[PDB]
Amino acid sequence: MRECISIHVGQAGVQIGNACWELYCLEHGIQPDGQMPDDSFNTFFSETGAGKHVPRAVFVDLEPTVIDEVRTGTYRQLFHPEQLITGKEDAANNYARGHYTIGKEIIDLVLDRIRKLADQCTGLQGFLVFHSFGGGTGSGFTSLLMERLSVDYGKKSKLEFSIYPAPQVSTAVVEPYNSILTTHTTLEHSDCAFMVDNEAIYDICRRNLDIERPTYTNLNRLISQIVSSITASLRFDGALNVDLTEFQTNLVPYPRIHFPLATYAPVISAEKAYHEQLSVAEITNACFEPANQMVKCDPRHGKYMACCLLYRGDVVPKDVNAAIATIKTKRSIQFVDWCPTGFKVGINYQPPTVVPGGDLAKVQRAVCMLSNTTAIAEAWARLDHKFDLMYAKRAFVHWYVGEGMEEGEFSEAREDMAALEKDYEEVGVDS
Amino acid sequence: KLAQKMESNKENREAHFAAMLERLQEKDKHAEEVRQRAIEENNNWIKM
Amino acid sequence: MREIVHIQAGQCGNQIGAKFWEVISDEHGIDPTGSYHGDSDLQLERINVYYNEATGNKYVPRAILVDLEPGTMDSVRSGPFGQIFRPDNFVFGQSGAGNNWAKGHYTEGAELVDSVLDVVRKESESCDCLQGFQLTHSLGGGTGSGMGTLLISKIREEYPDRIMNTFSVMPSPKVSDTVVEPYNATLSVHQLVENTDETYSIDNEALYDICFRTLKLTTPTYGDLNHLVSATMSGVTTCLRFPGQLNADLRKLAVNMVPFPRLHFFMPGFAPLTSRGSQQYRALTVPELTQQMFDSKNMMAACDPRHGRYLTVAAIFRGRMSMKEVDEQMLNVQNKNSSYFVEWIPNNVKTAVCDIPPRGLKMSATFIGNSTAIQELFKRISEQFTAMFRRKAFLHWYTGEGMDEMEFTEAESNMNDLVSEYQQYQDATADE
Ligand SMILES: Nc1nc2c(ncn2[C@@H]2O[C@H](COP(=O)(O)OP(=O)(O)OP(=O)(O)O)[C@@H](O)[C@H]2O)c(=O)[nH]1
Ligand SMILES: Nc1nc2c(ncn2[C@@H]2O[C@H](COP(=O)(O)OP(=O)(O)O)[C@@H](O)[C@H]2O)c(=O)[nH]1
C-alpha cells in the first residue's frame, strides 16, 4: 500500500539518511533493532516474519567509510546488509568518475537491490533521492542512477533532497562544475526537487541553536526535521494529508520549474525553557522571514506561484486561517498573475519529535512552508557564475576530459542552466 | 393515413437516436485514440 | 416511471451522497438497519423511487458508491447510516485520480468503469420501470468530475432513453483543495451540456458565502457546507418521493423545466437558511418563504436572479400551511417582479405543497429555477480557466495523461457558447 523507496547517495545523502531514519524510528516508536511494542508508517517500513520493521531504503557510496559507520553503528540491526552498498574507490570529487568510470561498475548491483525492494511493494508511489551536488558520488552517481530509474520504472514519481554546496563546509574547488553537471543530467528525470543550502542550515544552527562551529551532525538533525515534515503526510494519516502526486500537482506548474523553497519554524535551542510556547500566528509569521529559509535567496524580489503550509502538532484550522489572513494584509507577498489560490494547508496531528541529547527543543507545534518562488533562480545564478569563472579558463576541465567526458557536455550543461534561469524569468512576467 | 404517419414517426425517432449513438460512439473512438497516444509517447520517450 | 438509480462518485460525491441518504431515510422513517419505524403512510407511498424492498420489512437504498480511492468508502461504511448500503454496491479502486480530470476520465477511471456498470446494470434490470439516474459529484476534482462524466457517457450509451440527472458541485477559490479546479470544471461542464437532461448547479462559492456571511461561521467546514447541500437535495427531490401532482417524476420535471436541450442547468434556492447546530428557531411565514425566491442570499449557485430572467421555476413548499396563501403569495411575486420572468413561456412558474416538512423545520421552501443569470457561474469558471490556459499553466498534468490542447479549447468554447445561449434568451422578446 502506497510505498516510498528512499535512496541515499554519497556521504551527504548517507549521513542525512542516518538522521532521517533515526527520527522516523522515534516518531513511529521503532527501536534500533526494528522492534516496536496509525498503520501509515508501512509506506516507509516493511515488516518481516519476526515482526521487525525494516526501512524501505538503499544506501549507496563509492567509498566504504561512511556506510561502514552505519553497519557498525546503533542502527546496524535496523537495515539488512544487502541494502547498504559500497564500492572501493570514491569518485574523488569528480562527476565524470561518479557517472562513468567508477559508477558503471556498481550501477547494475544498486538497481538489482532497488528491484528487490520494489518487488516487496504492492503500490509503489516512487522514489526519494538524497544526495549532495558537490561530491563526485553525490553528483555523478545520482544522475547515472536517475537515468537508469526512468528506464526501469516508467512513469514512477522521483523526488530529490539535494544538498546545495556552501563554502563554510565545502570540500572541493570543483563543486560548481559537479553541481551544474548533475542538475543538467537529472532535470528531465526528476519530478520535484527540494534544495537544502548548507549555508542557510549553517546560519540557522549558529543563530537559532547557538552552535559556534556547526558540524554535519548539527546540520543533519535540522535537515531531518524538514524531511520529516514533508514525509509526515505519507507516514501518518491526519485530518489534512498530501501524497507523492498532490505535492507535485500543487507546487509544480511547469515541468522544469520543480524547485520549491522550504522554510521551517520554530527552531529553538534545547536550553532556555521560556522561549516557548509559540502560537500558530508566531510560527506562520516565521515562515516569511528569510532567516528561516533552507536556501539563501530573497522572495520579496521574486514572485510566488504556489504556497503549501504543513503544520504539525497542536494546530486548529481556525488558528491557521486567522494567521494567513493577517499575513495577506502585509501587501509585500506577491504572486504571479496566472495564480489565484495561493495557500494549500495541511495539518498532521503529531508534534515534532526531537533526538534525545540533540540541540533542538521539544515544541507543541511546528510548520514547514514549501513555496514555489522565482527567487530560487538566485541560487542557480550564484552556482552558474562560479562555473563561468573557472570554465572561461577551462580550469580543472582536464580532470573530467581524462575520465572520458567531452567539453561539449560542459557547454550543454551550462546552456541548459541558462535556459532554466530564463524559464524562471519568463514565468514571473505578467501576460 | 395513420400507417404513413407512425412509420414516418418510427423513422424520425430511430434517426434522432441513430445520430445519437453514432455521434456518441466516435466519442469513444477518440477516447481510445488519445489513450493509445497516452502510453505511445511515453514509450518512444524511453526509445531515446 | 418508478425507480431512480443513484450514483455517488468521488470524495465530494460520496460525502454529499451519504448525507442525502441519512436525511431522506429520516424523512421516510427508515433507521440505519433498513427498518421502517415511522408513523405516516405518506412516508411509504413512494418509497420505491429510492429504495428496494429486501426480504421482510427492510428497505435498501438503490445507491452505487464509487471512488478511485478506498478511504472515502471506509468513512461511509463507518458513518451513521453506513450499514444501510448494499455491500456489493461499493465499487472502489486503489489508485486515486489525484484531482486530475484526465486520470478520472481516461486512465484510472476507464479501468474501473466496467465494474461500476456491472453494479448499475444489476440495479437497473431489477427495476419494474426505471425513470433514470441521479449522480452526486464535484466538478473540481478528478474522480467525481472525470470519472463521473465518463460514467454519464457510458450509462447514456446503454440507457439512451432514461433521464440523466446530476447534483454537480462547482469549485470555488474560497474552498479550494487544488489550483487546477477551473480546468476540471470546464472539462466536466462540456460533458454535462451534452450528456445530462438536468443538472443542479450546487456552487461552493455560494455555500461558503452563506456559511460565512449569513450563518456567521468564521471558518466553515465541509460539514457546514454539506448541511446546506443536503437541505437542498431533500427539497428538490420532495416531488419525486412523496405523492403529488406536479413534477412527480424525472421526465415530467425535465419537460416542465427544460425549454431548450442545452439549457438544463438549475439554480437551486432554499429558505430558511439554518446551521447544523441551529435547532432554535421560531420564524418563517408564507410571505417570508416566498420573498426569498428572488433573494440572491438564498441561492445555492453564486448568481443574482435579478441579473437575469427565469425561463421556468418550480417551487416546493413544505410544512403545515394554507394552499390559498401560497397561491396568492406566488401570484403576487410574479406580478410584482414581471420583468424577471420571460413573457414567451406562459404560466412558467409551477408550485407544489407537501405536508411533510424537513427535519428540524416546521416550514420550508425550495426553489428550482432555470434562470439566464446562471451564465454568471459559467463566466466565473471561464475567466479562471483562461487566466491559467493563456499561460498553459499545469497543462503537463493533463498532456502527460495523453490529452491534447484541442480538448481544452473545445471545452472552453462550448461553455462560452452556453453563456452566449443564456444571453440570447435573456434578450429575447415576445414582440413576435
Ligand atoms: N548537510 C550535509 N552536507 C554534507 C554532508 N557530507 C557532505 N556534505 C556536503 O556535500 C559536499 C561534498 O560531497 P560528498 O557527499 O561528501 O561526497 P561524495 O558524494 O561521497 O562523493 P566522493 O567522495 O567524491 O566520491 C559538500 O558541499 C559538503 O559540504 C553531510 O553529512 N551533511
Ligand atoms: N460541498 C462539498 N465540496 C467538497 C467536499 N469534498 C470536496 N469538495 C470539493 O470538491 C472539489 C474537489 O473534488 P473531490 O470530490 O475532493 O475529488 P475527487 O475525489 O477526485 O472527486 C473541490 O471543489 C472541493 O472544494 C464536500 O464534502 N462537500
Ligand SMILES: [Mg+2]
Ligand atoms: Mg565521499
